[PDB]
Design a protein around this ligand. Sequence first.
Ligand SMILES: OC[C@H]1O[C@@](CO)(O[C@H]2O[C@H](CO)[C@@H](O)[C@H](O)[C@H]2O)[C@@H](O)[C@@H]1O
Length: 263
Amino acid sequence: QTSAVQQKLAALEKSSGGRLGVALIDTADNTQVLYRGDERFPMCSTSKVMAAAAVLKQSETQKQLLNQPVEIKPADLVNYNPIAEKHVNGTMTLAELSAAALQYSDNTAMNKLIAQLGGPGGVTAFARAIGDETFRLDRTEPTLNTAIPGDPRDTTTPRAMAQTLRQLTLGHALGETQRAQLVTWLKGNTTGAASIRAGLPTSWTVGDKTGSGDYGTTNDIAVIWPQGRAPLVLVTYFTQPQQNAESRRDVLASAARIIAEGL
Ligand SMILES: OC[C@H]1O[C@@](CO)(O[C@H]2O[C@H](CO)[C@@H](O)[C@H](O)[C@H]2O)[C@@H](O)[C@@H]1O
């Protein structure tokens, strides 16, 4: 059975030619609205939230960890390094790496966060520690974005990611200073204007992280503060049948617009 919200999302999915996954958590009453909410999707750069959060967790018991400089060598650069390239033969602190990963989607910065955690399994291990039993990070940048249909590597479900994003930003999976820091980072994202944000009332505050990959995978995860009512968490994942499909950030905007109706 489906609600009119789900029917609208199914129609958007049909017209787009792809596979759409949505999870909304309304924290006023802890209801969820799901569309393919227990199906796996490739996370692409939305996984940078879990990596940054895992480093924030480490910093709860190593007070200055975020301010630790990390060397950036020429060989560390991968395919998209808008911030790290400025620091080759220099340094970036773990805070600077987290900001670059989250707010610019810098892939060298993500690889440094993964290294800090001991490899992709360190990110997964943090997920498990905060009760996310679904997330898995298998690979580093850039290969975590291959997004092959049905491949479980580097995937999660919309429901799981919404539950976790809620725990990280509105709950207490992180300590007080750390939660606030994650929210500050997410709110300042520079890559999200065409995705969830484009579908929401303009007076709302939004923290988000986008992702993009092969198979035209186009993703966004967000914490949202509507005007006058309790915050929301919204996950929108989208992927397509052909390897070289174009991005479809508008699909995510349209999913957000649908979900916002009646909110
Ligand atoms: O930034 C370097 C740091 O990233 C890791 C992954 O956490 O390795 C990635 O970057 C290397 C250098 O560009 C690649 O050769 C490697 O395949 C890639 O995973 C760490 O191993 C490395 O210390």
